[PDB]
Amino acid sequence: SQLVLILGDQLSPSIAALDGVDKKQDTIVLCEVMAEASYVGHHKKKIAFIFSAMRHFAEELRGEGYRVRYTRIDDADNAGSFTGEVKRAIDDLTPSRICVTEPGEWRVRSEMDGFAGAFGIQVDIRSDRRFLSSHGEFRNWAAGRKSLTMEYFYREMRRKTGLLMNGEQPVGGRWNFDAENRQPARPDLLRPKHPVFAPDKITKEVIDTVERLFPDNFGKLENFGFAVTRTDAERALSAFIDDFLCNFGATQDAMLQDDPNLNHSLLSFYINCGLLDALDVCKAAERAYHEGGAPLNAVEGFIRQIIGWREYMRGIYWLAGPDYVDSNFFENDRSLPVFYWTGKTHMNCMAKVITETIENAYAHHIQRLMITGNFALLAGIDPKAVHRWYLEVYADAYEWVELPNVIGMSQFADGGFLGTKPYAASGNYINRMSDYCDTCRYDPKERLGDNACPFNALYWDFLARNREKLKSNHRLAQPYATWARMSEDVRHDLRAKAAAFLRKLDAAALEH
Ligand SMILES: Cc1cc2nc3c(=O)[nH]c(=O)nc-3n(C[C@H](O)[C@H](O)[C@H](O)COP(=O)(O)OP(=O)(O)OC[C@H]3O[C@@H](n4cnc5c(N)ncnc54)[C@H](O)[C@@H]3O)c2cc1C
Ligand SMILES: Cc1nc2c(=O)[nH]c(=O)nc-2n(C[C@H](O)[C@H](O)[C@H](O)CO)c1C
Ligand code: SF4
């Protein structure tokens, strides 16, 4: 008789561990434990969401005839940790085998690997069939090509899945439609609202418990709208197909002060805990393309994010090992500035995106990359500090998908290891791709003076102090040509003004 453990990001009735259990003999185990709610200061909505999806997933299995042992975060004898809770079940149920799908973070794998030695019982750790690449396939694909790019990997995934494939060639005779393409942003009022799901009896009781036990944690619980059931996630899926998919590629890089969502799917939360399955999400997009419902560039652009980037980040996470988090190519040591936790700044773009994060635990891609992520980079923040923030604040964050986005893509803390170019940009970009500057106190056209946006001076300071590590980068080559053309006292004034702002952040970091 078997003890099946299921982790909080594995809430799927065909997870690897349920393959061939005996509903009479065996016992599924789920547990809310303090070790996983507290290894980082998660956003309140993140904890509430995960807890509520677990309690709902527990009810799901029970209705399907499974023996389910559930341990609540506040239960009397809660042991506090996976190891502890599995121990309590072993004296309780005395199984002859523990079954578990492989976890999604290094830390958790560490604990899972200590099970067998610590309990003297067979532990069967199963590989996670939700992912198209095993660790073994990806390692071997990476070996025999000393340069890693998503594009060459994504090519393989299209072949392997047959998604958007005419047997042997890609639909429309291009793997990529990057893009068909761009163009400025519009506050389209004739745009449907993204779905919201009002909290039920379970979710309300978890909302109350989270506010009682994690009172000093990041984020507001008000306006909880996440789907916590499988049915509601599949409704979030079909609403995106029906209402937003056909404009996905059009508005992809745009930011609107008044539109936190535009045309994105808002599914990462569900895909990443098993409520939605990645390959089914992709097939629905493709099914919609063949029924005329969206253009080729929106669908391929959308599938590219899932079977391309998300699958590739996972691969990069395990390939790089646990100390990838120590990557600090630029040798930064500055603390994460204070307003990342308060939203209280006069940089209108930083204030909007951080306020959105506070209140919804969501911000879409270009926001994570070019607002908060770009500022961190230019300001020279310790990448470990940035990594903690991104893992804590967003309700779709687990280390495997967060860490390579932060270290590799955003902060370039690994010197371009995962193939991307560096995303440093001045306030010229933000003015082009948003309306944030319109109501901002600074001017995105000024570099010096009391009301220049600090992204401008910080942009050039960042190129100037790291010139040695970046001069050979055929992407910054034009900026450096622009730098050298500036008179000497101008380059001096820009770097002094960069320092004045840098000083103002360090002064604040000291008061705490
Ligand atoms: C600094 C930084 C931190 C990030 N942290 C996370 C994170 O913690 N969790 C997370 O899931 N994504 C993360 N991303 C990737 C991306 O920003 C999010 O997937 C996206 O915001 C999810 O929103 P959505 O579901 O509306 O995406 P959409 O724009 O609707 O994208 C469609 C789907 O593609 C997937 N996807 C898109 N981009 C990526 C990517 N770069 N890597 C992996 N999957 C992707 C998501 O599953 C998403 O649901 C991060 C990106 C950056 C630049
Ligand atoms: C906040 C939180 N709480 C739990 C929990 O109570 N029980 C659980 O099984 N999982 C939780 N998780 C997700 C895990 O910490 C971890 O990040 C995933 O297991 C990734 O493999 C999270 C993120
Ligand atoms: S000006 Fe520079 S600072 Fe003010 S919003 Fe535009 S970008 Fe943010």
XYZ file of C-alpha atoms and ligand atoms in Angstrom:
596
model
C 0.000 0.000 0.000
C 1.239 3.336 -1.142
C 1.606 6.884 0.155
C 1.193 9.369 -2.700
C 2.412 12.883 -2.026
C 1.240 15.798 -4.178
C 2.873 19.223 -4.136
C 1.000 22.488 -4.399
C 2.126 23.158 -7.989
C 1.121 19.648 -9.066
C -2.668 19.939 -8.786
C -3.529 17.760 -11.772
C -5.411 14.429 -11.745
C -2.883 12.957 -14.209
C 0.264 14.061 -12.338
C 3.013 11.451 -12.544
C 2.454 10.174 -8.997
C -1.182 9.064 -9.581
C -0.189 6.690 -12.387
C -1.446 3.350 -11.149
C -2.583 3.970 -7.599
C -5.269 1.790 -5.998
C -8.066 4.032 -4.730
C -8.893 1.509 -2.006
C -5.351 0.792 -0.826
C -3.479 4.047 -1.276
C -3.594 7.470 0.329
C -3.025 10.826 -1.331
C -1.335 13.394 0.906
C -1.510 17.185 0.599
C -0.264 19.578 3.277
C -0.040 23.299 3.836
C 3.243 23.715 5.743
C 5.055 26.694 7.204
C 8.370 25.833 5.513
C 6.846 26.368 2.029
C 4.785 29.441 2.953
C 7.787 31.191 4.497
C 11.024 30.397 2.659
C 10.268 33.754 1.030
C 7.761 36.416 1.973
C 5.148 35.435 -0.615
C 2.413 37.829 -1.662
C -0.716 37.289 0.415
C -2.733 36.614 -2.715
C -0.149 34.004 -3.742
C -0.500 32.063 -0.484
C -4.290 32.422 -0.447
C -4.458 31.277 -4.055
C -2.241 28.197 -3.596
C -3.955 27.173 -0.363
C -7.410 27.555 -1.901
C -6.495 25.587 -5.024
C -5.121 22.790 -2.839
C -8.205 22.559 -0.639
C -10.356 22.595 -3.789
C -8.165 19.993 -5.477
C -8.566 17.863 -2.346
C -12.355 18.029 -2.672
C -11.917 17.178 -6.352
C -10.105 13.900 -5.682
C -12.470 12.901 -2.903
C -15.398 13.104 -5.306
C -13.379 10.859 -7.625
C -13.136 8.160 -4.937
C -9.609 8.730 -3.535
C -8.453 8.434 0.065
C -7.102 11.928 0.786
C -5.152 13.002 3.860
C -5.164 16.798 4.141
C -3.147 18.905 6.577
C -4.126 22.545 6.980
C -1.636 25.351 7.738
C -3.406 25.861 11.090
C -4.248 22.246 12.029
C -3.341 21.224 15.563
C -0.547 18.709 15.025
C 0.837 20.179 11.775
C 4.490 19.184 11.562
C 5.587 22.263 9.567
C 7.485 20.693 6.655
C 7.135 18.102 3.947
C 9.519 15.760 5.810
C 7.624 16.297 9.044
C 4.182 15.780 7.559
C 5.266 12.675 5.641
C 6.678 11.341 8.924
C 3.343 11.772 10.702
C 1.634 9.879 7.876
C 4.125 6.990 7.998
C 3.446 6.028 11.629
C -0.215 6.664 10.816
C -0.656 4.724 7.570
C 2.567 2.576 7.630
C 2.990 2.352 3.840
C 5.476 0.199 1.983
C 6.307 2.919 -0.568
C 6.200 6.708 -1.032
C 5.336 8.030 -4.491
C 5.948 11.622 -5.616
C 6.365 13.578 -8.859
C 9.625 15.556 -9.065
C 9.470 19.087 -7.593
C 10.027 22.384 -9.351
C 12.714 23.935 -7.132
C 16.237 22.907 -6.116
C 15.610 23.380 -2.399
C 12.599 21.027 -2.515
C 14.479 18.383 -4.509
C 17.093 18.550 -1.726
C 14.484 17.635 0.874
C 12.824 14.988 -1.325
C 16.221 13.356 -1.832
C 16.587 12.978 1.922
C 13.374 10.923 2.272
C 14.687 7.398 1.692
C 17.661 7.746 4.004
C 15.504 9.295 6.711
C 12.588 6.834 6.642
C 14.046 3.535 5.492
C 11.290 3.036 2.948
C 11.341 2.964 -0.837
C 10.839 6.448 -2.313
C 9.791 6.485 -6.004
C 10.466 9.981 -7.392
C 8.722 10.262 -10.753
C 9.536 12.505 -13.660
C 6.953 15.173 -14.499
C 5.209 14.418 -17.821
C 3.801 17.993 -17.968
C 7.089 19.054 -19.557
C 8.083 18.185 -23.097
C 11.763 17.799 -22.283
C 13.213 15.580 -19.639
C 16.360 16.746 -17.904
C 18.175 14.098 -19.925
C 16.946 15.228 -23.335
C 17.706 18.885 -22.593
C 21.193 18.221 -21.221
C 21.991 16.226 -24.349
C 20.501 18.856 -26.642
C 22.631 21.479 -24.905
C 25.714 19.300 -25.315
C 27.011 19.532 -28.842
C 26.241 23.219 -29.300
C 28.324 25.514 -27.155
C 25.817 28.394 -27.787
C 22.252 28.183 -26.454
C 19.424 30.079 -28.103
C 15.703 29.711 -27.512
C 15.055 29.861 -31.270
C 16.941 26.640 -32.024
C 15.294 24.966 -29.060
C 11.822 26.212 -30.039
C 12.332 24.776 -33.540
C 12.719 21.365 -31.922
C 9.590 21.727 -29.812
C 7.442 22.617 -32.849
C 8.709 19.496 -34.607
C 8.168 17.384 -31.512
C 4.629 18.568 -30.777
C 3.457 18.956 -34.378
C 1.862 22.255 -33.309
C 1.431 24.653 -36.237
C 3.179 22.167 -38.509
C 2.406 21.101 -42.078
C 3.913 17.721 -41.428
C 7.531 18.785 -41.997
C 7.473 22.546 -42.568
C 6.069 25.261 -40.269
C 2.698 26.703 -41.211
C 3.075 29.764 -43.365
C 6.707 28.957 -44.194
C 8.333 30.694 -41.214
C 8.975 29.338 -37.720
C 8.732 32.911 -36.499
C 6.347 35.788 -36.967
C 8.297 38.281 -34.943
C 6.220 40.054 -35.842
C 3.444 41.129 -38.306
C 4.085 43.320 -36.260
C 4.102 46.151 -33.691
C 2.680 49.738 -33.606
C 1.630 52.180 -30.820
C -0.947 51.518 -28.093
C -4.644 52.386 -28.000
C -6.896 52.589 -24.889
C -9.458 50.334 -26.635
C -12.582 50.779 -24.500
C -14.487 48.308 -26.727
C -12.401 45.598 -25.040
C -13.878 42.817 -22.903
C -13.121 42.511 -19.218
C -10.969 39.595 -18.184
C -12.901 37.066 -16.091
C -12.994 37.200 -12.298
C -14.236 34.497 -9.951
C -15.767 35.619 -6.680
C -14.424 33.768 -3.618
C -16.444 30.815 -2.382
C -16.831 29.250 1.065
C -13.376 27.654 0.843
C -11.548 30.618 -0.653
C -13.154 32.995 1.875
C -12.033 30.863 4.814
C -8.504 30.753 3.383
C -8.487 34.508 2.788
C -9.326 34.962 6.466
C -6.632 32.533 7.613
C -3.926 34.107 5.424
C -4.680 37.596 6.810
C -4.450 36.139 10.337
C -1.123 34.284 9.909
C 0.817 36.359 7.369
C -0.215 39.864 8.416
C 3.064 41.613 7.562
C 3.403 39.996 4.120
C 3.539 41.845 0.810
C 0.281 42.617 -0.924
C -3.411 43.345 -0.447
C -5.930 40.536 -0.306
C -8.818 42.735 -1.462
C -10.571 41.799 -4.718
C -9.476 38.172 -4.875
C -10.517 37.044 -8.310
C -8.406 33.983 -9.161
C -9.979 30.771 -10.384
C -9.328 28.031 -7.822
C -11.083 25.127 -9.546
C -10.249 23.251 -12.739
C -13.549 24.225 -14.373
C -12.997 27.923 -13.687
C -9.488 27.747 -15.141
C -10.767 26.188 -18.338
C -13.233 29.121 -18.481
C -10.389 31.600 -18.090
C -8.808 29.670 -21.001
C -11.772 29.847 -23.362
C -12.508 33.511 -22.571
C -8.946 34.353 -23.683
C -9.379 32.449 -26.949
C -12.773 34.052 -27.510
C -11.967 37.639 -26.543
C -8.253 38.465 -26.539
C -6.237 35.917 -28.528
C -6.723 37.484 -31.958
C -5.075 40.704 -30.702
C -2.335 39.052 -28.622
C 0.539 39.834 -30.977
C -0.736 43.322 -31.811
C -0.572 44.794 -28.284
C 2.134 42.555 -26.867
C 4.724 45.194 -25.898
C 2.327 47.964 -24.908
C 1.665 49.414 -21.476
C -1.310 51.545 -20.503
C -1.565 53.368 -17.190
C -5.244 52.429 -17.130
C -5.069 48.864 -18.560
C -3.188 46.365 -16.360
C -4.212 43.446 -18.545
C -4.671 44.516 -22.173
C -4.727 41.318 -24.256
C -2.636 38.842 -22.226
C -4.069 35.509 -21.146
C -3.528 35.777 -17.366
C -3.096 31.991 -17.236
C 0.472 31.577 -15.844
C -1.001 31.081 -12.345
C -3.116 28.190 -13.545
C -0.678 26.581 -15.975
C 2.032 26.593 -13.320
C 0.074 24.692 -10.633
C -1.630 22.130 -12.896
C -5.095 23.640 -13.103
C -4.397 24.199 -16.797
C -2.041 22.069 -18.887
C 0.404 23.839 -21.194
C -0.012 21.562 -24.176
C -3.815 21.834 -24.060
C -3.608 25.650 -23.881
C -1.528 25.501 -27.077
C -3.892 23.161 -28.844
C -6.833 25.452 -28.113
C -4.956 28.360 -29.678
C -4.170 26.237 -32.723
C -7.745 24.964 -32.940
C -8.793 28.610 -32.953
C -6.370 29.430 -35.745
C -7.773 26.773 -38.072
C -11.344 28.041 -37.463
C -10.379 31.539 -38.660
C -10.461 32.970 -35.154
C -7.036 34.590 -34.937
C -4.199 35.460 -37.328
C -1.076 33.325 -37.655
C 1.124 35.853 -35.906
C -1.019 36.002 -32.756
C -1.296 32.229 -32.399
C 2.313 31.366 -33.206
C 3.386 34.269 -31.028
C 1.285 32.815 -28.243
C 2.444 29.210 -28.633
C 6.017 30.521 -28.821
C 5.806 31.788 -25.224
C 4.612 28.396 -23.902
C 6.369 25.611 -25.826
C 9.328 27.938 -26.493
C 10.306 30.159 -23.547
C 8.530 28.405 -20.637
C 9.874 24.984 -21.652
C 13.329 26.503 -22.247
C 13.478 28.320 -18.889
C 12.694 25.043 -17.097
C 15.511 23.358 -19.023
C 17.929 26.190 -18.189
C 17.029 26.072 -14.503
C 18.052 22.453 -14.019
C 20.946 22.561 -16.427
C 22.624 25.445 -14.568
C 22.441 23.957 -11.069
C 21.712 25.407 -7.642
C 24.411 28.132 -7.678
C 23.108 29.815 -10.833
C 21.462 32.120 -8.259
C 24.952 33.365 -7.304
C 25.548 34.769 -10.826
C 26.756 38.367 -10.578
C 28.575 39.197 -13.808
C 28.446 42.972 -13.060
C 29.508 42.509 -9.404
C 26.547 44.452 -7.953
C 26.043 44.854 -4.188
C 23.322 47.546 -3.834
C 20.188 46.721 -1.847
C 16.763 46.473 -3.429
C 15.323 49.997 -3.119
C 12.569 50.788 -0.700
C 9.706 51.668 -3.049
C 9.691 48.186 -4.562
C 7.855 47.340 -1.365
C 5.847 50.572 -0.980
C 5.073 51.747 -4.486
C 5.874 55.210 -3.133
C 7.974 56.889 -5.809
C 7.562 59.754 -8.272
C 8.573 57.616 -11.254
C 5.030 57.211 -12.540
C 5.829 53.992 -14.419
C 7.462 52.449 -11.379
C 4.564 53.534 -9.195
C 1.910 52.022 -11.477
C 3.589 48.665 -12.011
C 4.551 48.277 -8.339
C 1.057 49.336 -7.198
C -0.439 46.807 -9.642
C 1.862 44.161 -8.152
C 0.843 45.137 -4.614
C -2.838 44.858 -5.441
C -3.111 42.044 -7.985
C 0.197 40.110 -7.657
C 0.336 40.304 -11.436
C 2.169 42.330 -14.026
C 2.531 41.337 -17.656
C 5.771 40.509 -19.371
C 7.111 43.814 -20.692
C 6.289 45.383 -17.307
C 8.380 42.870 -15.407
C 11.166 43.265 -17.957
C 11.330 46.968 -18.907
C 9.952 48.794 -15.895
C 10.924 47.116 -12.642
C 13.487 44.786 -14.243
C 15.138 47.489 -16.305
C 15.463 49.856 -13.351
C 17.108 47.190 -11.133
C 19.683 46.527 -13.852
C 20.528 50.170 -14.531
C 20.626 50.928 -10.800
C 23.000 48.003 -10.265
C 20.990 46.024 -7.730
C 22.384 42.820 -6.241
C 20.742 40.215 -8.502
C 19.931 38.057 -5.462
C 17.864 40.951 -4.084
C 15.959 41.257 -7.364
C 15.462 37.495 -7.514
C 13.817 37.422 -4.092
C 11.417 40.231 -5.026
C 10.205 38.540 -8.235
C 9.795 35.158 -6.537
C 7.830 36.773 -3.667
C 5.501 39.254 -5.324
C 3.921 37.479 -8.309
C 1.357 34.728 -7.904
C 2.773 32.699 -10.840
C 6.333 32.525 -9.492
C 8.342 29.406 -8.699
C 12.115 29.326 -8.834
C 12.381 27.259 -12.020
C 10.482 29.807 -14.169
C 11.393 32.925 -12.177
C 15.170 32.549 -11.676
C 16.294 32.346 -15.354
C 13.880 35.146 -16.265
C 15.444 37.340 -13.582
C 19.113 36.313 -13.748
C 19.455 35.566 -17.431
C 16.865 37.624 -19.288
C 16.359 40.747 -17.119
C 19.522 41.393 -15.136
C 22.004 39.739 -17.557
C 23.698 38.537 -14.378
C 25.120 35.488 -16.221
C 26.685 37.483 -19.059
C 24.280 36.279 -21.742
C 24.423 32.564 -20.957
C 20.886 31.798 -22.070
C 21.365 33.535 -25.409
C 19.527 36.816 -24.869
C 20.803 40.322 -25.498
C 20.763 42.929 -22.693
C 17.493 44.833 -22.154
C 18.829 48.156 -20.917
C 16.685 51.079 -22.160
C 16.272 54.762 -21.311
C 12.992 56.584 -20.741
C 12.789 57.025 -24.536
C 11.535 53.441 -24.711
C 8.921 53.862 -21.976
C 7.571 56.969 -23.688
C 7.238 55.032 -26.959
C 5.569 51.929 -25.485
C 3.368 53.508 -22.809
C 1.380 56.494 -21.652
C 3.077 56.428 -18.254
C 5.150 59.555 -19.020
C 2.130 61.698 -19.811
C 1.160 62.156 -16.155
C 4.690 61.763 -14.840
C 6.498 64.662 -13.183
C 9.676 64.043 -15.090
C 10.276 64.638 -18.760
C 11.543 61.642 -20.778
C 13.366 64.090 -23.138
C 15.544 65.684 -20.429
C 18.737 63.987 -19.222
C 20.062 66.645 -16.832
C 18.099 68.988 -14.623
C 15.678 68.671 -11.743
C 12.988 66.891 -13.775
C 14.733 64.484 -16.117
C 13.534 60.931 -15.786
C 16.267 59.049 -13.913
C 16.210 56.218 -16.486
C 18.105 58.495 -18.890
C 21.136 59.287 -16.705
C 21.054 55.780 -15.202
C 21.017 54.387 -18.740
C 24.282 56.103 -19.622
C 25.906 55.540 -16.243
C 25.208 51.842 -16.670
C 26.820 51.712 -20.101
C 29.757 53.812 -18.811
C 30.719 51.865 -15.690
C 30.324 48.468 -17.430
C 31.970 49.507 -20.699
C 34.700 46.899 -20.181
C 32.330 43.938 -19.813
C 30.092 45.102 -22.699
C 32.245 46.885 -25.335
C 32.372 43.704 -27.463
C 28.547 43.435 -27.617
C 27.325 44.117 -31.174
C 24.058 45.291 -29.677
C 25.306 48.143 -27.459
C 27.773 49.137 -30.179
C 25.573 51.961 -31.435
C 24.961 53.431 -27.929
C 28.716 53.430 -27.282
C 29.221 55.237 -30.575
C 26.674 57.761 -29.258
C 28.474 58.037 -25.890
C 31.935 58.750 -27.376
C 30.380 61.507 -29.492
C 29.295 63.466 -26.390
C 31.514 66.292 -25.188
C 33.596 65.474 -22.127
C 31.778 67.707 -19.637
C 28.468 66.282 -20.865
C 29.563 62.731 -20.086
C 30.726 64.019 -16.713
C 27.411 65.717 -15.943
C 25.396 62.619 -16.857
C 27.467 60.393 -14.577
C 27.315 62.854 -11.691
C 23.533 63.075 -12.017
C 23.398 59.285 -12.049
C 25.380 59.295 -8.770
C 23.102 61.856 -7.093
C 20.126 59.528 -7.734
C 22.098 56.431 -6.717
C 22.995 58.222 -3.487
C 19.334 58.911 -2.788
C 18.525 55.175 -2.900
C 21.449 54.190 -0.690
C 20.492 56.837 1.854
C 17.054 55.232 2.157
C 18.356 51.644 2.273
C 20.285 52.638 5.414
C 17.228 53.770 7.413
C 15.937 50.167 7.439
C 11.796 39.636 -14.681
C 10.808 38.579 -15.069
C 10.273 37.721 -14.116
C 9.354 36.739 -14.494
N 8.835 35.884 -13.592
C 7.940 34.946 -13.992
C 7.334 34.016 -13.019
O 7.690 34.120 -11.841
N 6.438 33.104 -13.432
C 6.097 32.998 -14.724
O 5.286 32.109 -15.048
N 6.599 33.817 -15.679
C 7.479 34.791 -15.384
N 7.997 35.653 -16.347
C 7.591 35.524 -17.754
C 6.383 36.367 -18.133
O 6.568 37.752 -17.765
C 5.133 35.768 -17.504
O 4.945 34.443 -18.004
C 3.858 36.512 -17.849
O 3.816 37.780 -17.205
C 2.649 35.691 -17.440
O 1.548 36.502 -17.831
P 0.438 35.933 -18.797
O -0.049 34.599 -18.326
O -0.506 37.077 -18.909
O 1.316 35.772 -20.129
P 0.910 35.913 -21.690
O 1.510 37.167 -22.285
O -0.558 35.633 -21.885
O 1.819 34.685 -22.200
C 1.255 33.431 -22.569
C 1.849 32.352 -21.688
O 3.209 32.188 -22.060
C 3.972 31.850 -20.897
N 5.157 32.715 -20.869
C 5.228 33.926 -21.448
N 6.466 34.466 -21.297
C 7.202 33.577 -20.609
C 8.595 33.528 -20.125
N 9.401 34.571 -20.374
N 9.017 32.448 -19.429
C 8.158 31.429 -19.208
N 6.861 31.385 -19.623
C 6.337 32.424 -20.320
C 3.119 32.014 -19.684
O 2.734 30.699 -19.346
C 1.928 32.743 -20.208
O 0.804 32.346 -19.422
C 8.938 36.617 -15.926
C 9.474 37.488 -16.854
C 10.386 38.471 -16.483
C 10.938 39.392 -17.547
C 3.157 29.177 -0.506
C 3.215 27.714 -0.852
N 2.668 26.798 -0.015
C 2.716 25.473 -0.305
C 2.121 24.450 0.588
O 1.574 24.810 1.637
N 2.160 23.153 0.259
C 2.755 22.754 -0.878
O 2.778 21.530 -1.119
N 3.330 23.628 -1.757
C 3.355 24.970 -1.540
N 3.937 25.906 -2.429
C 4.635 25.491 -3.652
C 5.954 24.879 -3.126
O 6.588 25.702 -2.144
C 7.041 24.687 -4.163
O 7.448 25.979 -4.641
C 6.562 23.727 -5.229
O 6.428 22.482 -4.531
C 7.546 23.634 -6.412
O 7.936 22.284 -6.718
C 3.889 27.265 -2.098
C 4.517 28.245 -3.036
S 9.407 59.754 -17.559
Fe 10.978 58.329 -17.218
S 10.108 58.171 -15.257
Fe 8.425 59.417 -15.680
S 7.304 57.739 -16.417
Fe 8.243 58.118 -18.281
S 9.722 56.673 -17.763
Fe 8.915 56.501 -15.794
